[PDB]
Amino acid sequence: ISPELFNILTEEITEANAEAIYKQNFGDIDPACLAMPEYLKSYYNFSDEELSQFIRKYPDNELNTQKIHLLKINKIILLSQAVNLPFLKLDEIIPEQNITPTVLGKIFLVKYYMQKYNIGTETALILCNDSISQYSYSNQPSQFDR
Amino acid sequence: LLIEAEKVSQSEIWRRRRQEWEIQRNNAEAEMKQIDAQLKSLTVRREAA
Amino acid sequence: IEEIDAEKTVLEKSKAGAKSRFDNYSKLYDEDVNAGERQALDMRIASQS
Amino acid sequence: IEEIDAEKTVLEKSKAGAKSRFDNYSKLYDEDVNAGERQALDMRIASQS
Amino acid sequence: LTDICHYSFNEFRQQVSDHLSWSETNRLYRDAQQEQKENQLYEARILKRANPQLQNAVHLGITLPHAELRGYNSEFGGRASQYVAPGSVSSMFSPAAYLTELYREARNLHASDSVYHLDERRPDLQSMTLSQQNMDTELSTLSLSNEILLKGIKANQSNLDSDTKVMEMLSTFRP
Amino acid sequence: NPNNSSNRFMFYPVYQYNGNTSGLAQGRLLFHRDTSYSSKVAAWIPGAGRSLINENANIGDDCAEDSVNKPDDLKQYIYMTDSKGTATDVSGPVDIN
Amino acid sequence: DENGAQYMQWGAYRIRLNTLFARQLVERANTGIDTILSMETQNIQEPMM
Amino acid sequence: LLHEQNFDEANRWLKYVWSPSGYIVRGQIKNYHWNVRPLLENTSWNSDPLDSVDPDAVAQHDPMHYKVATFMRTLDLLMARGDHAYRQLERDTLNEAKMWYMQALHLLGNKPYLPLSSVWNDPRLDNAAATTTQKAHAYAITSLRQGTQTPALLLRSANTLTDLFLPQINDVMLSYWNKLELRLYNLRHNLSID
Amino acid sequence: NRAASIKSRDDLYQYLLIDNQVSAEIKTTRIAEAIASIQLYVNRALENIEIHAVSDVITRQFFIDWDKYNKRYSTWAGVSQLVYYPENYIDPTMRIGQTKMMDTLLQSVSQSQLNADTVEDAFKSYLTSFEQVANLEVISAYHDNVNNDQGLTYFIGNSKTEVNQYYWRSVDHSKFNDGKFAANAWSEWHKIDC
Amino acid sequence: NRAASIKSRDDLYQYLLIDNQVSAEIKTTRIAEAIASIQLYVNRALENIEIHAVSDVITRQFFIDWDKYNKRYSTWAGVSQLVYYPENYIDPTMRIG
C-alpha cells in the first residue's frame, strides 16, 4: 500500500469534484469507451470471467446500464489488485461504495487471520463479524451451499 | 529398385543404431548423477562419525 | 535426519533415470516403423509388381 | 572413520567408470556416421545414377 | 430443396403418382449435388474469416466483403462470433454430433411403436437443455440411472407426489 | 488512438471530391474497416467541428456521404471512431489527380 | 497446328491437348534451379489455338 | 530435409515458394510475395472435392489451404531451429534461441481475441434439433447462392437460425501460440526446456 | 409394457439404453451418457434385432456412412475437421493421386545423410523425367459413347524419340461445363509395355 | 511517441530492442546485448513488418548474404576465417570440383 494509493482510496468524491478527479485519474479517456468493458479488459488487464463480476456480465446489448460510476469502480479494482481478493468480498465489505480507513483495518484483520490460522476467505470474513453470503459466483456454490 | 531398397534399409538400421547409442548415453549420465548424490550422503555420514 | 534426506535425493536421481528410459522406449515403440522403412516395403512391392 | 574414507574411495572408482562410459558413448553418438559409411552411401547412389 | 435428407425412397413414396422415375432420380442427383454446392459456397465463404489468419497480412489470404455482406442479414451473425477450443457452443464438439444424431435417430421406428425412441424411455431427451454445465461436470452414472427410473415410475403408473411416496410404496410391494 | 481504441484495427479513409468524372451530388467519405459487425462510424473533424456519420456501417468498405461540400475542412486532423472500441488518427492529407 | 499447338475441335469448342513448355524451358533451365522456379518461368506463354 | 536436421538447406528450399522477405532478381526487389502463380490467383482445379474424403481434394478446390500449409511448415522450421539451439546451453546460443522464437512470434502477431460474450442461448434439444431449422438453413444458403432475394433483418427465420452452432477456430494452429509462449517463458526466466 | 418382452435386468438395460448394474464409483457427464444411449439404440436398430425397422430412413446417406464415420465421436470429428481444416491432414509425403515421377523423386531423397548437391542431382533426374512426358504428341484417339457430349475419350501419345513408348490417357465428357474441362476430368498418362 | 503504436510491454520490447521482463538472474555482456538489439532490428526491417522499409539499402550485397552468412556471429566468423585462413577448412578427403 503506497501512500499515493492511500490518497486515491482515502479521498471522497462528490459530483462537484467529479470530472476534475476523473481527468486526474484517467487523463483524457472518454467516458463512452471507458464504459464499454472491452476497453476495461484492455486497460485494467483482467480475464473475462473476472469481467463477469465488475459491473456485471456484458454482451453487445446494454446490460447493467450505468449513468456514470467510474471512480467508484476504480477504487475497488485497484484495491482488489493490491490485496488479491475476489469481488463478492469487496461487494460485501462496505456495500456503500466508499472507503474509510477502518475498512482498511477490517481488511488487514481478515488478511492477518488468513495468514495466522490458515483458513478460507469466507471463513475469516465470518471472523470479521460478517454474515454468511448466499450469493453464488465463479460457476461454484456459495458459502451457504458449500 | 532392389539397389535402392538396400540403400534405404541400410540408412534405417543406421538410424536405429544411433537411437540405441543415445539410450546408452542417457543411462550413463543418470548413473553418474546417482553416484554424485550418493557421495553427498556419504559425507553426511562422515560428519556424523 | 540429514542423511535420510540425502537418500531421498539419490532415489530422486534413480527415478528420473528410469523415467527417461520409460518415455524413450515408449516413444520408439509407438512410432513403430519409420517413413523410410515403409518406403523400403514400397520399393520391394514395386519390384514385385 | 577410516572405513568411511575407504567407502568414499570406492564411490570415486564407480564414478570414474560411469564417467568413462558417458564420454565414450557421447563421442560415438555425436560422431554419428563415419567417412566410409558416407562412402558406402555414395557408392550406392553412384550405382543408381 | 431438402431432397437429400428426404431420400429417393422418401421421395418415391410421395412420388408414385406425381412423375416418372427417371425424372425423379435426376431430381435426386441434382439436389444431392446442390447440397455439396451449399457446403462449398458456405465453407469458402466462412473460413476466410478465421481469426488466426487475419491478424497476419503477410499471408495476403484475403476476404471479399461482397458475398460476405449478405449472410449477416441472412443468418444473423452466424459468422460473427467464431468460438474458442471447444465447448458447448462449437460446431465440432459433442452437442453438434449429438443433435445431428438425434434428428437422424427420431424417425427410425414409427411413433406408434412401443420400441419407438421417444416412447420407449425418453421424453426426457427432448426436454434436455444444452448448457456448458451439462458438458463439463461428472456425476455418477448410477445416480442418473436411479433418477431416470424415478422419473418413469413417478410419471404415469401411480401418480405420486415425490420420491418418499415411491419409497413408501416400495416398502409396500411384496411380490 | 491509444485512448478510445481497444482493438488494433484502423479505418482507412479516402475523401472523394465532387465533380470531375463521376458527376456526383455531394462529396462523400469512403473508408475501410475490419470489425465485421455493423455499426455507425462517426468521422468527427475537430477543426471544423462537424462530423460525418453513416448509420448501418457496411462491412469492409462503405459509402458515407459528406453533407457540406467544403474540402478544406477535411485537410486537418480527422478523428474517426466506432464508439465500440475502435478509433483512428487520420492526418497527413495528399490531394491527387 | 503449324506453330506447334494441337487441339480438339469439339463442336464450337477448342481445347488444348499439349504444350510447348518443355521446348522453351531449356533456355531457362541452363543456369540453375533458381531460374527454374522463378515467377518468370511461370509466365512463359503458349501459342494461339 | 527438415526431418534430417539439416536446417538452412530446408530454409532455402522453402524460400522457393513463400519468401516473407520478398524476392530480389538481378539487384531489383520484385513486387510479388508468393512464388507460385495460382497462389496469387485462386484457381479451383478440382470441381468436386466432396466426391470422397480427401484432404488433397479439398486443398485442390481452394488453394488457400496450401498457403496455410506452407505457413505451418515455415513455423515448424523456425521452432525446430530454436529448439535445437536451446538444448545447447551456452549463453550466446540462448540469445539465438530468443531471437528465433521472437522471429516466429512477430510472424504470428498476437494471440487472437474472441468475445466470450456470445449469442448462444442454451436451447432445448428438441427445439434446436428441428428439421425446420435445417430446411430454412439449406433454402437460405441456396437463396444466397442464386442471388435472388432482398436482405432483411427480422427475428422470424432467425428464430431458426439462432440455434445453429458456431464455428470454432483451428486447434492445431492454436497450439502454436501456447507452445511458443511457453518456450519463451522458459527463456525469460532461467529454466530449461523441461 | 407387456408388449416389450422384459425378463431380466439386462433386458431392462436394452430397453432403457442406460445401465443399472454399474457400481456408483463410475463418473460420467450427462451428454456423453445420452450419446451412449443413442448409439446403443442405433446399433440395435441397424441389426433388425428389435423388430420392425422402418426401411425408409435406413437408406439415407447418414446411415450408409454410419459404420465407418458416424458411429464414434472421433471419426465424426475427423471428418468434420477434414472438411473445414484440411491443412491439419495435408502431408506432402503421401499424396493420393501421385505419379511415379514424384515417387522416384522421393525414393531418390529417402536416406539419412543429405547434402545439397545430392538433392540437386535428384532434382535434375526428376526434371529429365518431366521433360520426357511434357513433349507428348497425340497420334490418334477414340471416343467412347455414340455422341460427343457424353462418355469418355482415350488418347494415344507419342514421344519425340525412337522406338516409341506409346502413352495413353483418358478424359470424361460428363464433367464438362462452361467451355472447359475441369482438371479432375482428365487422367494421368499411362505407359504401354507391349 | 504517439506515432509508435505501443500498447503492452512486448510492444515496448519491440520498440526498444531490449527486454524488460527478463528476471535479473540472467547475466550478459554489453556488446552481446547491443548485437542482439541490432539483429532484432534487422530482422524486423527485412520482414517489412515495421512500415516503410527503404528499398535502396535492402538491395545491397550484405543483406543478400544476411540470411545465410551475416545473421549470426558464428557464420560471419566462419566466412571471415575462411577468407584469411583456408587451411583450417582444407580437407583433402572432400574437394569441390
Side-chain angles (χ1 to χ4, degrees):
Chain A
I1 301 297
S2 70
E4 183 68 30
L5 180 59
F6 182 70
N7 288 318
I8 293 170
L9 296 173
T10 298
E11 60 202 3
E12 290 181 353
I13 296 166
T14 64
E15 293 180 354
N17 53 2
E19 294 295 322
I21 199 168
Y22 175 76
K23 188 173 181 179
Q24 185 175 0
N25 289 319
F26 291 97
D28 50 358
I29 303 166
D30 290 330
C33 186
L34 184 57
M36 60 179 291
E38 298 297 321
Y39 181 73
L40 294 177
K41 184 171 184 175
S42 178
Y43 177 68
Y44 286 105
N45 193 1
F46 285 99
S47 177
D48 200 2
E49 193 276 335
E50 296 164 348
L51 194 65
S52 298
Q53 300 288 317
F54 285 113
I55 307 300
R56 276 181 64 187
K57 299 184 71 66
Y58 183 78
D60 202 4
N61 299 114
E62 291 185 356
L63 181 56
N64 197 354
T65 64
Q66 66 274 8
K67 298 178 181 179
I68 39 171
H69 53 88
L70 302 175
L71 304 166
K72 297 181 183 295
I73 193 66
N74 196 3
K75 293 183 179 181
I76 189 171
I77 286 168
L78 290 176
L79 180 63
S80 182
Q81 192 178 7
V83 78
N84 317 117
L85 289 177
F87 293 89
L88 176 141
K89 182 169 184 176
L90 293 175
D91 190 7
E92 181 180 0
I93 295 175
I94 190 166
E96 290 184 354
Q97 294 177 356
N98 291 315
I99 289 170
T100 169
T102 184
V103 178
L104 297 178
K106 290 181 182 290
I107 195 165
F108 171 65
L109 286 177
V110 63
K111 291 293 288 184
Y112 181 69
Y113 290 128
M114 289 180 190
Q115 188 173 5
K116 184 72 173 177
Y117 300 100
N118 198 0
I119 60 174
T121 181
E122 67 194 8
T123 306
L125 280 172
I126 301 300
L127 294 177
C128 290
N129 196 2
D130 196 358
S131 176
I132 298 169
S133 67
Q134 294 182 356
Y135 179 73
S136 65
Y137 66 99
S138 176
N139 293 321
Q140 285 175 353
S142 71
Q143 184 174 7
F144 183 79
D145 289 330
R146 286 184 288 110
Chain B
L1 288 180
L2 288 177
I3 294 166
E4 181 62 33
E6 294 179 357
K7 180 172 76 68
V8 66
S9 294
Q10 185 175 3
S11 69
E12 292 295 328
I13 68 169
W14 284 350
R15 182 180 292 118
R16 301 297 189 187
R17 189 181 70 193
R18 181 176 177 176
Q19 288 176 352
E20 289 182 354
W21 291 113
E22 188 170 1
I23 292 174
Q24 298 304 109
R25 186 186 66 182
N26 289 319
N27 289 329
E29 183 176 359
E31 186 179 3
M32 183 173 69
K33 286 185 175 67
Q34 178 183 2
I35 290 174
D36 288 334
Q38 188 170 0
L39 284 176
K40 295 293 178 67
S41 176
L42 187 56
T43 186
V44 171
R45 277 189 295 273
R46 184 185 180 273
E47 295 181 356
Chain C
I1 293 173
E2 179 181 358
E3 177 190 4
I4 215 163
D5 296 334
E7 294 294 325
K8 190 172 181 179
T9 302
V10 310
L11 290 183
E12 288 172 352
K13 299 293 184 183
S14 295
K15 173 67 178 294
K19 181 68 176 175
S20 174
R21 277 180 290 172
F22 173 72
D23 286 331
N24 200 357
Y25 281 112
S26 179
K27 181 180 183 294
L28 295 182
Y29 178 75
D30 289 334
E31 198 269 327
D32 48 357
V33 290
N34 288 319
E37 294 174 353
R38 191 173 181 179
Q39 294 298 321
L41 286 177
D42 195 5
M43 296 170 195
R44 296 290 181 88
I45 196 165
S47 182
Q48 180 187 3
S49 178
Chain D
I1 293 173
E2 179 181 359
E3 177 190 4
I4 215 163
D5 296 334
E7 294 294 325
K8 190 172 181 179
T9 302
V10 310
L11 291 183
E12 288 172 352
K13 299 293 184 183
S14 295
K15 173 67 178 294
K19 180 68 176 175
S20 174
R21 277 180 290 172
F22 173 72
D23 286 331
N24 200 357
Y25 281 112
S26 179
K27 181 180 183 294
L28 295 182
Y29 178 75
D30 289 334
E31 198 269 327
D32 47 357
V33 290
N34 288 319
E37 294 174 353
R38 191 173 181 179
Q39 294 298 321
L41 286 177
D42 195 5
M43 296 170 195
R44 296 290 181 88
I45 196 165
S47 181
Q48 180 187 3
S49 178
Chain E
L1 193 145
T2 196
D3 203 2
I4 187 162
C5 184
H6 185 79
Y7 197 71
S8 178
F9 189 70
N10 276 310
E11 192 183 3
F12 194 77
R13 295 292 182 182
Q14 294 181 357
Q15 201 172 4
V16 179
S17 177
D18 288 330
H19 293 91
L20 188 144
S21 177
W22 179 260
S23 179
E24 174 182 355
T25 186
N26 285 320
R27 291 179 180 177
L28 176 73
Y29 178 69
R30 284 180 183 176
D31 203 356
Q33 183 65 39
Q34 181 174 358
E35 178 68 27
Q36 290 181 356
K37 292 178 184 178
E38 291 180 355
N39 289 115
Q40 290 177 4
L41 186 70
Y42 180 72
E43 185 188 1
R45 177 255 183 94
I46 196 163
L47 68 86
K48 302 290 185 183
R49 182 162 178 169
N51 303 121
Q53 297 172 354
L54 59 82
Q55 194 179 5
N56 194 1
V58 181
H59 292 84
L60 197 142
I62 195 65
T63 178
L64 60 93
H66 185 73
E68 180 184 359
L69 189 153
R70 196 178 179 186
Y72 286 100
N73 293 112
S74 179
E75 289 171 349
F76 186 69
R79 188 181 181 180
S81 181
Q82 290 186 357
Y83 182 66
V84 201
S88 176
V89 183
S90 173
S91 174
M92 290 179 183
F93 194 72
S94 171
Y98 185 75
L99 190 146
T100 192
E101 191 166 354
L102 179 66
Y103 71 84
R104 296 292 182 184
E105 188 195 14
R107 294 181 180 179
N108 283 113
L109 303 179
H110 182 71
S112 175
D113 194 0
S114 177
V115 200
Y116 174 71
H117 170 72
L118 296 173
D119 196 3
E120 67 177 5
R121 179 57 202 94
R122 303 281 183 171
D124 56 350
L125 292 179
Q126 67 182 357
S127 67
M128 186 178 74
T129 187
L130 296 176
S131 71
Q132 186 63 42
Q133 297 180 358
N134 290 322
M135 170 187 165
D136 292 337
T137 186
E138 289 183 353
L139 48 91
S140 176
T141 306
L142 190 63
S143 65
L144 200 151
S145 178
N146 291 317
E147 182 178 359
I148 188 171
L149 285 172
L150 290 173
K151 291 177 184 179
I153 298 168
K154 188 187 286 187
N156 195 4
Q157 190 70 40
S158 297
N159 299 118
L160 296 179
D161 197 3
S162 176
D163 299 329
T164 178
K165 305 295 183 180
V166 185
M167 296 303 175
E168 286 177 351
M169 75 178 297
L170 263 72
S171 68
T172 307
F173 187 78
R174 296 181 180 181
Chain F
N1 189 4
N3 298 320
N4 299 118
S5 68
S6 64
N7 300 112
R8 285 186 173 182
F9 288 164
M10 294 179 182
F11 294 107
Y12 287 154
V14 170
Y15 178 67
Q16 185 181 6
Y17 283 90
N18 195 357
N20 294 320
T21 299
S22 66
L24 298 174
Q26 294 178 357
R28 62 186 178 182
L29 180 60
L30 300 172
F31 60 96
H32 183 84
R33 66 183 178 93
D34 291 330
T35 62
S36 178
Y37 61 95
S38 180
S39 64
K40 64 182 184 180
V41 177
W44 181 71
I45 296 96
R50 66 181 176 91
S51 68
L52 295 177
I53 196 165
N54 194 358
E55 301 295 326
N56 191 4
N58 199 2
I59 301 165
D61 49 352
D62 195 2
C63 182
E65 182 178 1
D66 189 359
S67 297
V68 175
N69 193 1
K70 183 176 181 179
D72 196 5
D73 288 329
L74 295 170
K75 294 292 179 70
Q76 62 269 17
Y77 176 71
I78 298 168
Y79 180 72
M80 293 183 72
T81 186
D82 196 5
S83 297
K84 288 180 181 180
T86 302
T88 304
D89 304 333
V90 176
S91 62
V94 172
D95 193 2
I96 58 171
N97 192 2
Chain G
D1 197 359
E2 178 180 1
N3 53 7
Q6 285 185 354
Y7 59 93
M8 175 179 68
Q9 185 73 46
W10 189 62
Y13 298 96
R14 291 183 180 181
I15 181 163
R16 187 175 287 163
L17 302 176
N18 53 3
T19 183
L20 295 176
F21 179 72
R23 301 286 186 179
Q24 298 176 357
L25 184 60
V26 180
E27 180 177 359
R28 304 292 295 165
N30 195 2
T31 180
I33 302 167
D34 307 333
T35 306
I36 303 169
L37 302 176
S38 71
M39 184 62 70
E40 185 181 2
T41 304
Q42 296 176 359
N43 291 320
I44 288 173
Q45 286 183 355
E46 187 68 28
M48 183 169 69
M49 301 177 190
Chain H
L1 285 173
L2 181 59
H3 289 170
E4 295 295 329
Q5 303 295 318
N6 192 359
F7 289 97
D8 286 330
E9 189 66 33
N11 197 358
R12 62 175 286 166
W13 275 98
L14 286 174
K15 287 182 181 179
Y16 288 108
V17 173
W18 178 67
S19 179
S21 177
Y23 293 95
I24 299 170
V25 176
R26 192 188 174 185
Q28 189 181 9
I29 171 167
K30 289 296 180 184
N31 191 6
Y32 56 88
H33 196 77
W34 291 89
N35 202 4
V36 181
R37 187 177 68 195
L39 291 178
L40 293 177
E41 296 173 352
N42 287 318
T43 306
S44 181
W45 64 286
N46 188 358
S47 286
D48 297 330
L50 296 175
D51 290 333
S52 67
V53 285
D54 189 5
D56 291 326
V58 188
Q60 288 175 355
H61 189 274
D62 200 359
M64 65 175 293
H65 302 94
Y66 293 117
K67 285 184 178 180
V68 175
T70 303
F71 182 72
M72 288 184 183
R73 296 297 179 271
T74 306
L75 293 182
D76 289 331
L77 177 61
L78 291 180
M79 188 179 175
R81 295 174 69 95
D83 285 329
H84 183 273
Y86 187 74
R87 291 179 178 88
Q88 294 177 357
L89 292 173
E90 66 180 358
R91 181 178 61 84
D92 299 337
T93 311
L94 293 173
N95 300 321
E96 179 182 356
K98 185 181 287 184
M99 65 179 283
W100 288 116
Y101 292 118
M102 281 303 299
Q103 182 174 359
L105 284 176
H106 71 81
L107 280 176
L108 290 180
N110 291 318
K111 182 175 183 289
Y113 175 71
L114 296 178
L116 277 73
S117 298
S118 177
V119 193
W120 177 256
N121 196 1
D122 289 333
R124 293 175 58 84
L125 180 65
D126 199 2
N127 194 3
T131 183
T132 304
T133 299
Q134 184 185 4
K135 291 181 181 179
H137 179 71
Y139 181 73
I141 292 174
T142 57
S143 301
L144 304 185
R145 190 175 70 207
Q146 291 176 355
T148 180
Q149 78 272 16
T150 302
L153 196 148
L154 201 153
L155 274 72
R156 183 179 178 181
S157 297
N159 196 1
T160 66
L161 299 176
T162 299
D163 292 329
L164 293 176
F165 293 91
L166 294 174
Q168 69 175 354
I169 71 169
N170 196 359
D171 195 3
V172 180
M173 191 64 201
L174 190 145
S175 176
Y176 286 99
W177 279 276
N178 301 117
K179 199 172 183 180
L180 293 181
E181 181 175 358
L182 190 143
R183 293 288 186 269
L184 191 139
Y185 179 77
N186 287 323
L187 274 168
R188 281 180 177 171
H189 305 289
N190 207 358
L191 300 176
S192 68
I193 193 163
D194 293 332
Chain I
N1 300 116
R2 192 178 178 181
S5 173
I6 301 167
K7 301 289 183 68
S8 67
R9 296 179 65 185
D10 293 333
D11 301 332
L12 186 64
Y13 170 65
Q14 295 187 357
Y15 182 72
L16 302 185
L17 302 166
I18 189 166
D19 199 350
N20 52 2
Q21 294 178 359
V22 178
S23 68
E25 183 177 357
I26 302 300
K27 299 293 182 183
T28 56
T29 69
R30 184 183 297 272
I31 299 171
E33 179 63 33
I35 284 172
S37 294
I38 286 177
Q39 285 179 353
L40 195 62
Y41 178 73
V42 172
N43 283 320
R44 296 293 298 277
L46 289 178
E47 298 295 325
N48 201 358
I49 174 168
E50 296 180 356
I51 197 166
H52 293 91
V54 174
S55 298
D56 198 358
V57 187
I58 303 169
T59 185
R60 291 181 179 181
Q61 181 56 256
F62 180 78
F63 295 101
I64 300 166
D65 294 334
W66 176 258
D67 299 327
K68 192 183 290 184
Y69 291 147
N70 299 321
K71 188 174 181 178
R72 289 186 294 271
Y73 176 76
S74 296
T75 64
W76 183 77
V79 174
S80 177
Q81 287 185 356
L82 194 142
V83 175
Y84 287 89
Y85 297 99
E87 67 273 16
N88 296 323
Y89 300 99
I90 295 173
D91 197 359
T93 295
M94 293 181 69
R95 183 187 65 246
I96 300 168
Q98 184 176 0
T99 67
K100 293 182 181 179
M101 292 165 61
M102 298 302 290
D103 289 330
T104 189
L105 176 63
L106 178 63
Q107 293 181 353
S108 300
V109 298
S110 297
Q111 69 268 18
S112 296
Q113 294 294 105
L114 290 174
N115 196 359
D117 299 334
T118 298
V119 176
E120 177 177 359
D121 287 329
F123 183 73
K124 298 295 286 186
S125 296
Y126 173 72
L127 188 61
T128 297
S129 65
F130 176 73
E131 186 193 8
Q132 186 175 3
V133 301
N135 294 113
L136 295 175
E137 184 181 3
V138 177
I139 305 103
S140 66
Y142 178 74
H143 185 274
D144 195 357
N145 199 359
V146 60
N147 50 0
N148 302 117
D149 296 334
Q150 291 82 17
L152 278 77
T153 297
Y154 295 95
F155 294 100
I156 294 299
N158 192 0
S159 65
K160 197 186 180 191
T161 60
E162 207 173 3
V163 183
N164 196 6
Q165 304 174 359
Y166 289 96
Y167 289 156
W168 68 271
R169 73 186 300 166
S170 67
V171 64
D172 192 0
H173 295 286
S174 69
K175 290 185 180 181
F176 183 77
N177 47 0
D178 286 332
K180 183 61 185 292
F181 282 155
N184 50 5
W186 291 98
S187 67
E188 300 169 353
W189 292 99
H190 298 285
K191 183 175 169 64
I192 301 165
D193 289 329
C194 182
Chain J
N1 300 116
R2 191 178 178 181
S5 173
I6 301 166
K7 301 289 183 68
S8 67
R9 296 179 65 185
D10 293 333
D11 301 332
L12 186 64
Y13 170 65
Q14 295 187 357
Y15 182 72
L16 302 185
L17 302 166
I18 189 166
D19 199 350
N20 53 2
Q21 294 178 359
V22 178
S23 68
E25 183 177 357
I26 302 300
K27 299 293 181 183
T28 56
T29 69
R30 184 183 297 272
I31 299 171
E33 179 63 33
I35 284 172
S37 294
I38 286 177
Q39 285 179 353
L40 195 62
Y41 178 74
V42 172
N43 283 320
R44 296 293 298 277
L46 289 178
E47 298 295 325
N48 201 358
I49 174 168
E50 296 180 356
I51 197 166
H52 293 91
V54 174
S55 298
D56 198 358
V57 187
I58 303 169
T59 185
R60 291 181 179 181
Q61 181 56 256
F62 180 78
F63 295 101
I64 300 166
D65 294 334
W66 176 258
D67 299 327
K68 192 183 290 184
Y69 291 147
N70 299 321
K71 188 174 181 178
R72 290 186 294 271
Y73 176 76
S74 296
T75 64
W76 183 77
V79 174
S80 177
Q81 287 185 356
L82 194 142
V83 175
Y84 287 89
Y85 297 99
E87 67 273 16
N88 296 323
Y89 300 99
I90 295 173
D91 197 359
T93 295
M94 293 181 69
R95 183 187 65 246
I96 300 168

